[PDB]
mmCIF file of C-alpha atoms and ligand atoms in Angstrom:
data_model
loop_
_atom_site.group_PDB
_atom_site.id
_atom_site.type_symbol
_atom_site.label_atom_id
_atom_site.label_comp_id
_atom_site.label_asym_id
_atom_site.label_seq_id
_atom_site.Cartn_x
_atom_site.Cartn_y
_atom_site.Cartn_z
ATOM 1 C CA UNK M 2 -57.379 122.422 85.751
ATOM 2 C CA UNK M 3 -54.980 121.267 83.461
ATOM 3 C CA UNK M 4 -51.819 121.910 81.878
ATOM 4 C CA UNK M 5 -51.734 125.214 79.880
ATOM 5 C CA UNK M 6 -49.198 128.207 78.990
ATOM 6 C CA UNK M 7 -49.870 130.541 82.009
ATOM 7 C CA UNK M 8 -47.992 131.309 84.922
ATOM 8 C CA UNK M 9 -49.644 129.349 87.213
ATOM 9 C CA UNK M 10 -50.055 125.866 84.854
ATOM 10 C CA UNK M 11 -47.238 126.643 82.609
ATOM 11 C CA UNK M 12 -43.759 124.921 81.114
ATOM 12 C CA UNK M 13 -41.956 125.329 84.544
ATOM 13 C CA UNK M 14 -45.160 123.721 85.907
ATOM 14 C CA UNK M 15 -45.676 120.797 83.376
ATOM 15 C CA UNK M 16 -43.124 117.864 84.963
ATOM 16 C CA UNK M 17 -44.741 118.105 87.955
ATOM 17 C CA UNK M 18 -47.577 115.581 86.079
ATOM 18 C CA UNK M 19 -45.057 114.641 83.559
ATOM 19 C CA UNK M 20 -41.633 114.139 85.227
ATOM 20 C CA UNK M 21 -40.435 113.099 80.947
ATOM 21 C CA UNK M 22 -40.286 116.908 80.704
ATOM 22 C CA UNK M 23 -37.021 116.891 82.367
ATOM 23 C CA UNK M 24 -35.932 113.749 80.021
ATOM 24 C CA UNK M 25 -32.939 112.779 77.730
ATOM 25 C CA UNK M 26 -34.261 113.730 74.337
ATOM 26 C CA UNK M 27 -36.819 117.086 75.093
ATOM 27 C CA UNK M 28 -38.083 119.645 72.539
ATOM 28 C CA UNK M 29 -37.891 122.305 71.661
ATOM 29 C CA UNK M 30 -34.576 123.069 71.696
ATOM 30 C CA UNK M 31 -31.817 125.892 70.038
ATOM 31 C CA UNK M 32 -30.545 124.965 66.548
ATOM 32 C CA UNK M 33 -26.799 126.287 66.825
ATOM 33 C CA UNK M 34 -26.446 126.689 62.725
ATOM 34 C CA UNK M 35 -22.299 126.202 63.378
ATOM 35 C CA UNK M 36 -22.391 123.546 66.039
ATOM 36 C CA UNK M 37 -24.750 121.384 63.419
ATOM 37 C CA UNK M 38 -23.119 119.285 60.937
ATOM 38 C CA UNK M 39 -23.743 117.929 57.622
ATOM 39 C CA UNK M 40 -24.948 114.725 57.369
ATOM 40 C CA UNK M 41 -24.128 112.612 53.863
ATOM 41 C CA UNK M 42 -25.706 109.823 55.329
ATOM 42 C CA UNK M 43 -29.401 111.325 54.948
ATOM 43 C CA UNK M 44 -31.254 110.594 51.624
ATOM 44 C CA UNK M 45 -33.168 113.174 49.862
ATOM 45 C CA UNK M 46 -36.024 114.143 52.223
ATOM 46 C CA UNK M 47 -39.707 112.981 50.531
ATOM 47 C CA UNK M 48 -43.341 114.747 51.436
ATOM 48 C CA UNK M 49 -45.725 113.563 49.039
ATOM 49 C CA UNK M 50 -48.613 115.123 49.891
ATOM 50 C CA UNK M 51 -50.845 114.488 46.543
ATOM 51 C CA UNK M 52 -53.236 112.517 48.191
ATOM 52 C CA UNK M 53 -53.774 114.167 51.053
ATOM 53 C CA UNK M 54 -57.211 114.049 52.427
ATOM 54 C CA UNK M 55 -58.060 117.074 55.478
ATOM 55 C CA UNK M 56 -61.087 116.390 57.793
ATOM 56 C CA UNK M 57 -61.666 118.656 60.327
ATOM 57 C CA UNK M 58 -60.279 121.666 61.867
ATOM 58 C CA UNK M 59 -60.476 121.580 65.738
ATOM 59 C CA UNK M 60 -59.781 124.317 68.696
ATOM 60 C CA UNK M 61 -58.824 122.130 71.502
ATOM 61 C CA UNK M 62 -57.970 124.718 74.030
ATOM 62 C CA UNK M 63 -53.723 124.772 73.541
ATOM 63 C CA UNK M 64 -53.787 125.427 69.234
ATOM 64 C CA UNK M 65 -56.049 124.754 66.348
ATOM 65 C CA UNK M 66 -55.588 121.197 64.530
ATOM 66 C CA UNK M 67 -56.136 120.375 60.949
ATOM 67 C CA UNK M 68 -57.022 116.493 61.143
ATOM 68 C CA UNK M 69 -56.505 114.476 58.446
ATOM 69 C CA UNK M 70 -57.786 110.900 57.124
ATOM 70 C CA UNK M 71 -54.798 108.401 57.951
ATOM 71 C CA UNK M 72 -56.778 105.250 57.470
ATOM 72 C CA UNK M 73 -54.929 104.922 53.825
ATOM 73 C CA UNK M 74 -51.232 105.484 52.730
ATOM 74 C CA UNK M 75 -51.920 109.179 51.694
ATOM 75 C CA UNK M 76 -49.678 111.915 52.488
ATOM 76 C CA UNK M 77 -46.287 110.254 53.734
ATOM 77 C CA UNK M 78 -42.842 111.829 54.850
ATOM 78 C CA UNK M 79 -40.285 109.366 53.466
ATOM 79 C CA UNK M 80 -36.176 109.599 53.257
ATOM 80 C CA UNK M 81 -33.691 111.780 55.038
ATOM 81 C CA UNK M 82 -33.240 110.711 58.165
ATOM 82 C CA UNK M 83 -36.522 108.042 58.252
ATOM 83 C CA UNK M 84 -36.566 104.856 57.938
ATOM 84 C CA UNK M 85 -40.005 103.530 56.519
ATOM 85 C CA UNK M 86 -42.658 105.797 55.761
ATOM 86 C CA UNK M 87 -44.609 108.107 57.974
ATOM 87 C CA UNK M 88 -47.880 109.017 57.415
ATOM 88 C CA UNK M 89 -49.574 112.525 57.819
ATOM 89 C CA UNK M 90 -52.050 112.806 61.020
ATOM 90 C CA UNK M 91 -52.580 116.169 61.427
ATOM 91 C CA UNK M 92 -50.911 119.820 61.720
ATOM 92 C CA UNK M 93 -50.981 122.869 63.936
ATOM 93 C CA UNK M 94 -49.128 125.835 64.723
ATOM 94 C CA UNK M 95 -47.502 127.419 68.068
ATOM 95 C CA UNK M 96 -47.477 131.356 67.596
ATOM 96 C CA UNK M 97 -46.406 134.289 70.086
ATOM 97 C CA UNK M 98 -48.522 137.530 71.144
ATOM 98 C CA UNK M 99 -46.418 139.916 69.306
ATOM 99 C CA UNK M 100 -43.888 138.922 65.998
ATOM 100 C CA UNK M 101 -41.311 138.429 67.962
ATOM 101 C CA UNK M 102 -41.800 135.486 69.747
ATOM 102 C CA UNK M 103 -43.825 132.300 68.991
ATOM 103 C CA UNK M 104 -42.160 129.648 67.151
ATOM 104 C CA UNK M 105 -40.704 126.713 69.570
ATOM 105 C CA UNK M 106 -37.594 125.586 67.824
ATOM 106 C CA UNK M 107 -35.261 128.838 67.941
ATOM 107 C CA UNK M 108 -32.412 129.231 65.302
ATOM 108 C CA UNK M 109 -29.184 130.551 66.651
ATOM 109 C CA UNK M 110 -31.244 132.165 69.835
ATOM 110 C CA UNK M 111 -33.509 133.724 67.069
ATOM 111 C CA UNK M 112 -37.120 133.507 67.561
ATOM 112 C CA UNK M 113 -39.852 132.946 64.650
ATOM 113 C CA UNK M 114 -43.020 134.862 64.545
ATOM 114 C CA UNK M 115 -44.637 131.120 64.885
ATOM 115 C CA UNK M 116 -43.844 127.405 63.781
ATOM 116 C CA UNK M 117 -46.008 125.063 61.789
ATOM 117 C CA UNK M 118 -45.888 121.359 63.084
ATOM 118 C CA UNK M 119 -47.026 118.660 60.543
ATOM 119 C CA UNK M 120 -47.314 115.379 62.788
ATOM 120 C CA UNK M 121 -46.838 112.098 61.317
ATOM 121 C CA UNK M 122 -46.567 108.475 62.613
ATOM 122 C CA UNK M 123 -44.408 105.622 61.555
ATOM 123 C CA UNK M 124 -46.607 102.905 59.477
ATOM 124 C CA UNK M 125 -44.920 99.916 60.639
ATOM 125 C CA UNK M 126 -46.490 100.554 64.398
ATOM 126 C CA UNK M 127 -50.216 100.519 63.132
ATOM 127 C CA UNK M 128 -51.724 103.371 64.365
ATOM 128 C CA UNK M 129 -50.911 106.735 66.389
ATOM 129 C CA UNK M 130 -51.309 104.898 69.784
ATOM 130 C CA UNK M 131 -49.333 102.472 69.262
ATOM 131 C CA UNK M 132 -46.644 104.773 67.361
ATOM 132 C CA UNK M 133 -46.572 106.610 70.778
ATOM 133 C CA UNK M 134 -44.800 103.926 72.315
ATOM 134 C CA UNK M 135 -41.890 103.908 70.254
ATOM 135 C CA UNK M 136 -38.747 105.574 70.429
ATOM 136 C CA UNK M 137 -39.033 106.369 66.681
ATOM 137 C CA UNK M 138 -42.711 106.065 66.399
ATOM 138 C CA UNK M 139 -43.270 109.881 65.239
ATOM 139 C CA UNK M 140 -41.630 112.670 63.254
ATOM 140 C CA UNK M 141 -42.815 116.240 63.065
ATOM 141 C CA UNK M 142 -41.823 118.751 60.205
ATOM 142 C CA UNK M 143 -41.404 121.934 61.343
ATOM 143 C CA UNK M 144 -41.703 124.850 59.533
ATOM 144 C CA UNK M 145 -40.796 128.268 61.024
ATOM 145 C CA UNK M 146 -43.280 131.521 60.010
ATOM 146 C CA UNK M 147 -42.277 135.084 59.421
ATOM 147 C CA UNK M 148 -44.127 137.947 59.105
ATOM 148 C CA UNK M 149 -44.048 139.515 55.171
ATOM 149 C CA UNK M 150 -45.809 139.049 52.379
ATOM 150 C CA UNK M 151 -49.230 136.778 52.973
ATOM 151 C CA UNK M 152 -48.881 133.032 52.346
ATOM 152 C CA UNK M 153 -52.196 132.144 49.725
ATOM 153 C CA UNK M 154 -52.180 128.782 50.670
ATOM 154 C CA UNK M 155 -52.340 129.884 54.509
ATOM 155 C CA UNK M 156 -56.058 131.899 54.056
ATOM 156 C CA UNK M 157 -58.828 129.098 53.935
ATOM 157 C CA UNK M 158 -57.494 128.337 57.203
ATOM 158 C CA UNK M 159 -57.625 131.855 58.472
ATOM 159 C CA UNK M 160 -60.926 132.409 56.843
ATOM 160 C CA UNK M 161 -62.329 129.357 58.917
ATOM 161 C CA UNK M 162 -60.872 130.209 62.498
ATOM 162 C CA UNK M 163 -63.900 132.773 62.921
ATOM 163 C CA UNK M 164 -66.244 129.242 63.197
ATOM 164 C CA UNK M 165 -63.730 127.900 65.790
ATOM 165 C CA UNK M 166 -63.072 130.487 68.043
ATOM 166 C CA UNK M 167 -63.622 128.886 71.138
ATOM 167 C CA UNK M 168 -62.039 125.307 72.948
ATOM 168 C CA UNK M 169 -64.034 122.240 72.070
ATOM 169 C CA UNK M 170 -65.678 123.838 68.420
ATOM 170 C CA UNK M 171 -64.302 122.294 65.566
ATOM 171 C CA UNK M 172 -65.743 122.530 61.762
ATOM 172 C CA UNK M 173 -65.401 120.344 58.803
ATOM 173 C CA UNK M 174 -62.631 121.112 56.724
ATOM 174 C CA UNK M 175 -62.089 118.895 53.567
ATOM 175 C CA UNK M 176 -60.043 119.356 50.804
ATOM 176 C CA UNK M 177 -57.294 121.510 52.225
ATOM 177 C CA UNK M 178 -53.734 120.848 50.282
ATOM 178 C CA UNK M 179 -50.977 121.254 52.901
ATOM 179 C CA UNK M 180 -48.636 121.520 50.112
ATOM 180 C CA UNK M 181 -49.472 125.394 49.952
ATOM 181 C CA UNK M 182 -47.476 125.901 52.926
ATOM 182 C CA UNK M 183 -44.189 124.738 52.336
ATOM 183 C CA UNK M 184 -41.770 126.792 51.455
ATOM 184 C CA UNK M 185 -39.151 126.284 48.019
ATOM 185 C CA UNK M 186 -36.112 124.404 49.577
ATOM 186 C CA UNK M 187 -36.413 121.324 51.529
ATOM 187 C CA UNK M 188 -33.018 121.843 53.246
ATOM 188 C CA UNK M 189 -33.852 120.988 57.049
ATOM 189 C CA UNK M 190 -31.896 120.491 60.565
ATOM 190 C CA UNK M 191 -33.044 117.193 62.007
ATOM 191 C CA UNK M 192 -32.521 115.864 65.906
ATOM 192 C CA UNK M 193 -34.466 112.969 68.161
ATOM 193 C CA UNK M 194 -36.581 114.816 70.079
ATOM 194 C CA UNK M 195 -40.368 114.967 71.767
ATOM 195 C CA UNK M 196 -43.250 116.259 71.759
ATOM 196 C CA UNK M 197 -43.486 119.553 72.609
ATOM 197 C CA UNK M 198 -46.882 119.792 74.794
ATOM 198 C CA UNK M 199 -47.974 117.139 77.333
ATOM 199 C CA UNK M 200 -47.398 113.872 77.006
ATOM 200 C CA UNK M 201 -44.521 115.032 76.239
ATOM 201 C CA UNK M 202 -43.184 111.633 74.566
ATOM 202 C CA UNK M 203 -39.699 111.311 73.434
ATOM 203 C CA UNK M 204 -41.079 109.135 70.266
ATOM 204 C CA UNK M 205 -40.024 112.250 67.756
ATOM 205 C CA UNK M 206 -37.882 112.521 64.684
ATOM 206 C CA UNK M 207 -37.858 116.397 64.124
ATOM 207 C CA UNK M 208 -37.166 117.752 60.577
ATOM 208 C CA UNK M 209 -37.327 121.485 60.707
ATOM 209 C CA UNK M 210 -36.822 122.913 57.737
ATOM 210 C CA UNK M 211 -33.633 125.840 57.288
ATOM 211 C CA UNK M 212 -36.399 128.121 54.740
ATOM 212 C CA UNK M 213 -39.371 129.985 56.299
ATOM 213 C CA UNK M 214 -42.079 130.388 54.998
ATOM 214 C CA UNK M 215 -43.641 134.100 55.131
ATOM 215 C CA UNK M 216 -47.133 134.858 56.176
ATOM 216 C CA UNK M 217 -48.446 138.570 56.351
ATOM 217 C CA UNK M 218 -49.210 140.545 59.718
ATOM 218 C CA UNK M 219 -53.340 139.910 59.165
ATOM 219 C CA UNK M 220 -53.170 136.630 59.002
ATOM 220 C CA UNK M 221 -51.206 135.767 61.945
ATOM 221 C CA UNK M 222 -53.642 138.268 63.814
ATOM 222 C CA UNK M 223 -56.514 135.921 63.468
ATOM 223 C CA UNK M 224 -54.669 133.344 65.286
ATOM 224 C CA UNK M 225 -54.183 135.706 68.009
ATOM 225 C CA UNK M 226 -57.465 136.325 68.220
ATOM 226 C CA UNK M 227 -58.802 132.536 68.591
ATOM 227 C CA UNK M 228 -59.538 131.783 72.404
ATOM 228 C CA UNK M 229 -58.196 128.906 75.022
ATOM 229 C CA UNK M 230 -61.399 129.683 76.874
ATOM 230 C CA UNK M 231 -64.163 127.861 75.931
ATOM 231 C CA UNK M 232 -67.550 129.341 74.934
ATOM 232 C CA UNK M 233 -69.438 131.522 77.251
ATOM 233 C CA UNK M 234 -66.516 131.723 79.476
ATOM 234 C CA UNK M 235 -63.902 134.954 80.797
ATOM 235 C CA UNK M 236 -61.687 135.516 76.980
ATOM 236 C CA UNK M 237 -58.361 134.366 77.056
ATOM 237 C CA UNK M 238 -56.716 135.227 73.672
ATOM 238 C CA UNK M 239 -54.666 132.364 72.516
ATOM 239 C CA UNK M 240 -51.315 133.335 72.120
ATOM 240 C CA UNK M 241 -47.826 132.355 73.004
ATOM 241 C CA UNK M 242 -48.529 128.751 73.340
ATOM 242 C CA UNK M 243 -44.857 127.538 72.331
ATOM 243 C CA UNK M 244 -42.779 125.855 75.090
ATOM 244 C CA UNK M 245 -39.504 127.451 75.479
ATOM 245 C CA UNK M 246 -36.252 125.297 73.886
ATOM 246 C CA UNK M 247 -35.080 122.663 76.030
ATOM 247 C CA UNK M 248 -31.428 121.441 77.108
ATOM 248 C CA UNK M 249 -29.517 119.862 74.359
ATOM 249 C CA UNK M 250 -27.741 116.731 76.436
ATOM 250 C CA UNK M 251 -26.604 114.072 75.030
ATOM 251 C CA UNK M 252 -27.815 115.020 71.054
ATOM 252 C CA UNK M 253 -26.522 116.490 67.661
ATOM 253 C CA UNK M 254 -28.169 118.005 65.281
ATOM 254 C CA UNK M 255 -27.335 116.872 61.544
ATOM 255 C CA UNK M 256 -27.744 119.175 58.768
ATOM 256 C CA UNK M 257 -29.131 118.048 55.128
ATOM 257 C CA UNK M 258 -27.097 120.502 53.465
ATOM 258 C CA UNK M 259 -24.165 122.884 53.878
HETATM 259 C C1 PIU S 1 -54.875 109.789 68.852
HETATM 260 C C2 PIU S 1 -54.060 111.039 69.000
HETATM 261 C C3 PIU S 1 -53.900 111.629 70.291
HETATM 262 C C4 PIU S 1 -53.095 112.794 70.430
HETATM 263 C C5 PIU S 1 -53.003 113.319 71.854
HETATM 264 N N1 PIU S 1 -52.455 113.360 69.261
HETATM 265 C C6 PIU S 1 -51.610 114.617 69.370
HETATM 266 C C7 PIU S 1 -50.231 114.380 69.980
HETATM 267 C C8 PIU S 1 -49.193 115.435 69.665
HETATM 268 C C9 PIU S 1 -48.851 116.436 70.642
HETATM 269 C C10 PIU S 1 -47.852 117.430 70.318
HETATM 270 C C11 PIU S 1 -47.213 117.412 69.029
HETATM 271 S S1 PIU S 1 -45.877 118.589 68.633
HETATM 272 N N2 PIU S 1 -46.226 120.011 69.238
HETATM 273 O O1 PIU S 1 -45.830 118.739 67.200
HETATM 274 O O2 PIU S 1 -44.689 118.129 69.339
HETATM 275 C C12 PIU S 1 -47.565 116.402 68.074
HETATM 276 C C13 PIU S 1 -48.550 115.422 68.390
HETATM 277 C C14 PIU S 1 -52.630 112.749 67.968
HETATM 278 C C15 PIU S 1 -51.993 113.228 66.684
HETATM 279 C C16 PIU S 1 -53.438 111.590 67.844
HETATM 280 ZN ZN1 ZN S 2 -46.566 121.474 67.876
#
């Protein structure tokens, strides 16, 4: 058995088969609003996601992923604090068993009721593999959820979770525009971090934007109800699969804005 979120194969447990997790640069970790300061060497932060080209949605036993066709420069993350261009892999969430809790990154100690993670890789390296072995091979932009009003551009994917309940099912999923999950202001935090599930790989530029986006109390129900058990086997709902925020060290947090 492999890593998971329980008690017995948990975050305390994971640097037993990855000692990184007690590394240099770890996520998640705390954003202290006041301790993070404005940055005027960051250029205007870029997502052009026009051309953006979704796949397949897969349940792979720790979250749900919405892949996406990276063979062509299609959906890149460009500016602030990149250099290059990054393009758009996939994206999945992290989301708690109850509103208050689920969202990896905190704010001030403050906990999200989940956080979307839109993974992309740094061009010059190739491919994802090879991105992996770079210290700025990656960069994730996080975006925290609340619980409100319903996000529109949120419900295909609710709507299709029902065909992917269990680990291992996937089901095609084309056409999907990420753009209808960003929120209105681009103003983000940004830190070198990791990834924040085994491998663990300290390869990350996070960008998490300041602005939430809101998404109402029945959608984020169907991703509690989405299983890390596979088919046929005891349920485990799949909840609370965020990893709790990590020391600081060495790091600062810049701010885009003020
Ligand atoms: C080929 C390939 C193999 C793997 C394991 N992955 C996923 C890796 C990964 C793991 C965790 C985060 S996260 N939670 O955003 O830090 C982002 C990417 C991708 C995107 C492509
Ligand atoms: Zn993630």
């Amino acid at each position: 058995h492999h890593w998971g979120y329980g008690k017995h194969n948990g975050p305390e447990h994971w640097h037993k088969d990855f000692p990184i997790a007690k590394g240099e640069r770890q996520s998640p970790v705390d954003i202290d609003t006041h301790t993070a300061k404005y940055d005027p060497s960051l250029k205007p932060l870029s997502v052009s996601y026009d051309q953006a080209t979704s796949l397949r949605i897969l349940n792979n036993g720790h979250a749900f992923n919405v892949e996406f066709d990276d063979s062509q420069d299609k959906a890149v993350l460009k500016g602030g604090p990149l250099d290059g261009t990054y393009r758009l892999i996939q994206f999945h969430f992290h989301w708690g068993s109850l509103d208050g809790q689920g969202s990896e990154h905190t704010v001030d100690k403050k906990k999200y009721a989940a956080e979307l993670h839109l993974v992309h890789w740094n061009t010059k390296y190739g491919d994802f593999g090879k991105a992996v072995q770079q210290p700025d091979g990656l960069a994730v932009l996080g975006i925290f959820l609340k619980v409100g009003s319903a996000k529109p551009g949120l419900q295909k994917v609710v709507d299709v979770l029902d065909s992917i309940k269990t680990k291992g099912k996937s089901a095609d999923f084309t056409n999907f525009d990420p753009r209808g999950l960003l929120p209105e202001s681009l103003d983000y935090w940004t830190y070198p971090g990791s990834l924040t599930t085994p491998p663990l790989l300290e390869c990350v530029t996070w960008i998490v934007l300041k602005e939430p986006i809101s998404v109402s109390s029945e959608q984020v129900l169907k991703f509690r109800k989405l299983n890390f058990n596979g088919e046929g086997e005891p349920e485990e709902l799949m909840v609370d699969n965020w990893r709790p925020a990590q020391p600081l060290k060495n790091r600062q947090i810049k701010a885009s804005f003020k």
